[model samples]
Target: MAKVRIYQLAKELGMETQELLELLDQMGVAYKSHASTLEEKDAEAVRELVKEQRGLQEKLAEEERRKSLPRRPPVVVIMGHVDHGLTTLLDYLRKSRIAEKEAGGITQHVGAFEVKTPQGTVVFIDTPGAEAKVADIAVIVIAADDGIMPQTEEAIAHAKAAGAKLIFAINKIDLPQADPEKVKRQLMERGFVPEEYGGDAIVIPISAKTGQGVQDLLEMILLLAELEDYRADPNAEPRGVILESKLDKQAGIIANMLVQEGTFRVGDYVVAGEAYGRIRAMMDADGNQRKEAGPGSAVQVLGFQELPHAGDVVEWVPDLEAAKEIAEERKEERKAREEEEKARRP
Candidate 1:
C-alpha cells in the first residue's frame, strides 16, 4: 500500500491533525498509524468531508452577506448659515406648512428627527449653526442671490472632512432676484456641480416660501441613499455620534445621538462626550419610548450624568471604571492644549 503521512491528510482536509483525529474517532473511522504508513478507509472520505466543510463555509458567508445588506434609512445632516431657510425647508417636508412656523421654528438646536415619506423613512439632523459640523450628507442651502457665504464654506469643508456627499439647495428661487444660474456657477467654481449640469451631484432649486422642489429633494435623498448602499453591523459594539446634549432640570442629562452601528438598547452602557450612562431610556423624535435603535435613528437618551458635546463620538466600553479614567486623562490633555494655545496668543 502507498504510505501517506497523517500531516498530509490533515493539510488536505483543512484541519488540525489532532482535530481530524478526534473527528475520525467520533465518526468511528478506524485508523492505525505506524511510522506514517497504514490508514483506514479511502481518500474519498477525506475528499467528501473537505467538500462538505467548504459548502458549509460558503453557506455561512452568504448568510452573513444577506444580514449585512443595507436596509436602513439614509442619515442626512443639513448645514448652512443661520437664515438660509434650512429649518423652513425641513418644516415644509415634515408638516407641509412652512409659513406658519417660519419665525419660531422648534428645530433650532443640534438634534435628530425622522420623517416618513411615501418612498421611505428619512432621518434629518437639525444642527445649530455652531454645532452643525459634520454629516453623512451636507445640504448646503443658500439663497440664489446670496451665493455661498462664510458658513457655507465652513460647512463644505466640514462635510468633506466627514466624507459626506454634498447636495446644493438653491432656496428662494421664486424671488425675482433669485438667480439659479449664478448660484450654480458659484457652486461649480467651489467644486460642486449639480446633476442637472452633467455632474454626479444633485441640486434641487427650492423655494421655501412656495414649497417648490421639496418632493424632488426628498426623492433625490432616497435615490442617493440607494446609491450609497450604507450598512452597519448589529453584532459589534455600538458606536455613534452625538448631535447635541444638555442638562434638563427635570430629566437630568440628555443627549441626542445618531446611532452609526450596532444595537443601542435601553440598558446598554454608553460613553459619550464627557458623560457615561447606563441608558435609562431611549426616545425617538416623537418622544415614544423604544427598546433599541439601529443606524440612522435619532434618539434622545436620558440618564447621563454630564452632557456630551455636539459631534462627539459615542462608544460602548466594557469596563466603566476604565472608561472614566481614560476620559479624565483626555480631559486633562484638552485643558493643557487649550492653556498652551492661550499662552501663545499675543
Candidate 2:
C-alpha cells in the first residue's frame, strides 16, 4: 500500500515534525513517531486541510484588522486654473469668508480648512496647484464658460502624480454663456471623461455663486470616501506638516497644520524644522477650540519657539528637552552647511 511518512508530510506542509504531530493530535488523527507511515489518502486530506486553514487564518486576521482600525476623513485639494472659482466652491461649502479674504480675489497662499458635510467631515487644501501630494482627492474646478486652460492642465498633472482621485466641478454654470458640454468635452481630451458619457470620471455642474449642485459634489466626495475606506491609526505616533505659519502679534508663532495620522492634543511637545515648543492651544478651521484632533484634521496650532517653514514636517516628541535637543541638532547642521557654502564661494 502506498503510504507517506510523518516527516515527509511535515516537509510537504512546510511545518516542523513536532508541530505536525501536535496538529494531528488536535485534529484527532492517528499518528505515531516522525517515521510513522499513513495512507496516501490521509496524507492528502491533511494537506488540503492545511491549505484551507492557512487562507482562512490570514483572511480572518485581515478582516479583524480592518474592523479594528478607525476610519479617517479624506484630505481633498481644491485645484484648478486661475479665476476658475476654486475658492468660491470651497467658500460655498464652508460658508466662510474665503474669496473676499484673498488678494485681488486670487488665492495668495495655500489655506488648509475643514468642512463639515452632511455625510461626514472633509479637509480641503486651497491653492493654485501644489499640496496635492498629500491629498486623497482633487476637485478640478473648471469654469463652464471659460473651458479648459493652462493652469487646469497643471492641476491635473499634480493630481495624477499624487494618485488623487479627480472630480470635475463645472463651475460658473449659472452664467448665461455657460456650456457644461463644451467644458466636459475639453476635459475629456485631457483624460477626464465624464461618468455621464460612460466614463469613470465624476462631473458635476455647479455654480458656487448660486450654491447650485454644490451639495451633490460633497455627496460624491463622501461616496468616494466610502469606497476607498480611508483609515488611520489614532494610537500611532503623531506626524503632520505645517500648511501655513506666521508670527501673530498677540499669539506667538501660529501654524496652520494638517494632522495626517495619529492624534494631537494640547500641551504636547512637538518639533517642526529647527523649532520646538509645547502646544499652547489648538483650534479647528472654524476657530473653535479643540482639546484633541485626529487624522485628517486641519488645525491652527499656537506654540513654537521659532517660526517653522511652510511644508515642514511636524513630529511629536516625548518632552520639551527632547524637542529642544532635536531642534538644536538641526540648527547646527544648517549652520555647518552655511559655513561650508560660504567657504566654497570665497
Candidate 3:
C-alpha cells in the first residue's frame, strides 16, 4: 500500500522519471510530471512496459540496419583552397550553378546536382567546399608539387571535423613540377599515410588539364558504391533541406528545397525553419510545375509565411496546427536571442 514518488522511484530503479511517465502514457494513464507519485503496482507495470518498448526499439534498429541498399549515388564534396584547383577536380559532366545571394541578393547552390558529362552524374555539384553543407564524402585536392599549402591544411581540418569519408586527389600531376610523392609525404606528416603507406584513405593522382587520370577518379567514385550503404525510406514522412529561399513578386514565398526522403505534394503541410505553410505549389529542377516529388528531387516550393534561409531543415508536420506551433516556437526563440543581444549591447 505504498506510493512512491515518480522521481524517487526512478532514482531507485536507475531510470529517468520521464521513462516511467512515458510508460504510463502508453497505458492510457493520466499522470502529471516527475512530481507525480505512482502506486507500487502501476509503477511496476509501467516499468515492464518501458522495458518492452526498449526491447522492441532495439529489434527495430537491427532490422532496419539489415535493410540497407547502397544503390544511391554518393554525395561527394570537393574541399580545397581557392589557389588549389578545386573547380576542375571533378570535371563537369553536369553543371549546377547559382550565385548564393547575400540573403538580400542571394544565389547559391547547396548540394550536388544531376549533370550529364563523360562520367554522367557520378556525384554532386561543383561548389566551393568552404560553402558546403552536409555531404557524405569529401575529396581533399592539392597540387602534386606544391605539397601542403595553408588552404590545403585547412581543407583537411574541415573534412576531418565533419567526419566525412576522405579521398585524396593529387591534381596537376601532368605539370613538370608535379610531385605526387612529395605532396603525399607532406600530407603524411599531417597524419595521412597513403594506401601504399598502410593508411585506409583512398588516394588518386589526376590531371584535370589533360584529363589523364580523370577516368580513374570516376572509377573510384563508382567503386564507392561497393564500400558504403545509402538507403532512404521513401515511405516515411517527407523531409528536405532548404537549399535557398527567397521572396518572389508573383509567387509569394519560394523555398528551393531538396527532397531528402518521402514524397511531398502540393497539399502537404510543411515547415522549414521558422516558415510554416501548406504546400500550395511545387516545381521541379527544370522549373516545370509539379504536384509531387520523392527523394533526390529538387523542387521550388511555395506556401510559406516567411522564406527560410539556406541550411534550414524542411519537414512535414502532422497538421497546420503543428506547423504553426513550430513556427511560433522558433519565433519566440529568435526573439529571446535578439533581446539577449540587445541587452548585452546597452
Q: Which candidate ranks first by lDDT, i.e. highest?
A: 2
Predicted structure 2: lDDT: 0.81
- Output the worst ten-in-a-row residue range by lDDT, candidate 2: 101-110
Q: What's the residue-level lDDT of 325 in candidate 3? A: 94
> Distance from true position, residue 59, model 3, in Å?
19
lDDT value for candidate 1? Answer: 0.74
The reply for model 3, stretches above 4 Å from the true place, is 1-70, 95-111, 115-121, 247-252, 286-288, 344-346
What are the per-residue Cα lDDT tens digits for candidate 2 across 166-264?
Answer: 988889987899998998789788776888879888898888998888878888898999999998888789988887789778876888778877888
Model 3, range 240-267, lDDT digits (tens) per residue? 8877777778767787777777889888
- Between which residue pairs do clashes occur in model 2? none
Show model 1 residue runs off by greater than 4 Å.
1-67, 96-110, 128-134, 332-346
RMSD of each: 8.8, 10.2, 14.9
Candidate 2 TM-score over all chains jointly: 0.71
Winner on lDDT (2 vs 3)? 2
Given candidate 2, what's the lDDT at residue 25? 87
Give the CA lDDT, 0 to 100, for residue 224 in model 2.
95
lDDT of each: 0.74, 0.81, 0.72
